[PDB]
Amino acid sequence: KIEEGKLVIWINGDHGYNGLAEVGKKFEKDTGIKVTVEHPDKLEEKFPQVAATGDGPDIIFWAHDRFGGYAQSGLLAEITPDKAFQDKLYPFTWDAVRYNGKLIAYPIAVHALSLIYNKDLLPNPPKTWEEIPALDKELKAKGKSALMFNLQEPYFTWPLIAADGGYAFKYENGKYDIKDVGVDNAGAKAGLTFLVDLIKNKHMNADTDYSIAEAAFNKGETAMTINGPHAWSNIDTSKVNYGVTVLPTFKGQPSKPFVGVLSAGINAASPNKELAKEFLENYLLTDEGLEAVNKDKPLGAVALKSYEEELAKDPRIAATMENAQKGEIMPNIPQMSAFWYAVRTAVINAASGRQTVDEALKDAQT
Template sequence: MFKKTVGVILSAGLVMAPITACSSNSDSASSPAASGAASPASSASTAPSTSSTAGAELQPEKGAVLTLWEDKEAKQWATEVAAAFKAKYNVEVKIEEVPAPDQAGRLTTDGPAGTGGDVVLFPQDKLGDAASAGLLLPNDVFAKDVTARSQKNAIEASTYKGTLYGYPKSVETYALFYNKDLVPNPPKTWDEVIAFAKIFNDEKARKYAIMWEVKTLYYDYAFMAPYGAYVFGGKGTDSNDIGLNNSGAVKGLTFMQSLRSILPPKVADLTFDIKTQLFADGKLAMNIDGPWSIGSFKDKINLGVAPLPDLPEGKKSVSFSGVRSYYVNTYTKYPKAARLLANFLTSKENQLSCYQKTGILPANQEVANDSAVKADALSSAFLTQFASSEIMPSIPAMASVWAPMEGAVTSIWDTNADVKSTLDSAAKTIKEQITSGKK
């Protein structure tokens, strides 16, 4: 359902594009009338209270018609929810299929032009740019209800500079996929992985015990964070404090570098497509991947999913995780109706139906604890790993991190480069890019 989401999120070019757009449109976003564009809705005039009572009393604007931008995987579900919303509020909702990672970028132009979705959906790493550009209305009517029903990490991920903007829909992280026919019992430690690899690996036949996208910080972070590494200080909010070259980062990547002994290919041969094919063909026993790939394997192999193996010294792997939330477009003509829709989409009933129809992992904590979800071993494994995850920073400076770290990790893996000096160089580049972007 989220196939290649990570590739989209982590591609430097795709990440930078919407950020540049946000920057270039920030002026027009604050004064759309100058160009004849749509005027932003007034948050103060339409949302006087954050109480549940205010939410219950909120009524849609007369004649409101909304557009919802939704991912392909959930379009059919959203269509059914839209029909239920119309039955309740007499507001028509049109569904437009737009990939979630692309929506924030499109909103920078379509929002001020008056052609954007009234309610949109995107991952939390886009939130900082969208909020800074004035593209989103705060979640100020249903904040208490949404906070109470959502997982804590999901609320934090949907909040920027102390303001809750999002209505969390789904959570995602990565875990250990394994072929039950090759690995009846998933390893609990990396020592077990290494021992298995020595028996299973056959490089000439392209058979490997385990793979992940080595060049990508998104996955490598699981080796670093347990030892004290971090991207930015202040829980991901202080871009002046970079923790990707501290002693914990060095220790974690030094261990990862040692795994070249059981995974000899260079990073160019450790891509999403290559490992997906090898795993589907039964030549890869274990694959670190996310819920977006379940559909690629469920009918091809005897699939199992487990939390990531523990690192040396008994350290629990801390995966990066993401949250997709609905947001209300500042430029909507119907801010009351749009708020009602965003809240309606993320109710317990609708999140449960979304999970049942799509397999998308819910951000709603009641749904996550529902017996139907817990009974699914694959979903339960991801939710267990999510509990040991860390939300990716959502500040705009995050865009400056991916490419320098990809270059650093490639050198560390492919050429056995010195970990400390390579990470120092990457951190310096990240800092320079952040500083340059602030000018």
């Protein structure tokens, strides 16, 4: 069982666990209660195991898309923020931590894809997808290319597919309708066709993955890529003069990336639920608490309005949140997994020519 009278917190080592431990110190220095921050390997797989026997940490930090499965198993306590605290965070971030109508975690950080561009090769990046073919022809006359990004994973291609009407599961009145999938409607077909035409006209290559795209942009071979906040650390080393901006529009509508929310959940077996609430609301989710974690390792964009307004002085972070609000929350329901594999195969088959766009998307509907 979980020990009463202390807080044990699990958070991945790629986040500011040392900064989180300093927040624990301010807590441990005006409450008396000790906070121990641990970063065990594969914590997202260990947590459901230990929490099923009534053990594990008091608080777990992870991407919200895994918290739906935790909540399905009753591993997470229903949190009780009052309306005043809820208004301190962006409303769409609360959508990411709701399961079966219950809030089951506190939103912390916000992740979304943006357009990354080389200011030297391209000082004013394009605003729409439609102008990218001609811009590629201009750059190819100089021996550069316009755009390279990961075509193997649908996380990277979905923003264009979703723009004109494609969607995963219909989201209304706070619930996903698993009987309503929108991968082969007219809008999804239109965006995927534009993608395939880019490959047929040799503006992109179907075999490009994460590594080929990153290496090409970091060496100045291509003018743009598409990636998230975790990729910036590599571009900084390349000394490529780069910027981050809003994704291009398609048919006048914004590209719609899926939004990931780093969230903090309270173990349902914890005897320290009131201590955890005090720590998360009044120490971590403050300007001073988020600053302590951010100075350790950058969080990207954040769900707390007051601190996001300061972080957005960085145009890369402002662009991240702008794309996040133009996108959609990643569904946390279990059917989401069958969606991703289906769309992954459809995009791969349409890009290579194994299937037409219509046939690939139809097979993805079922």
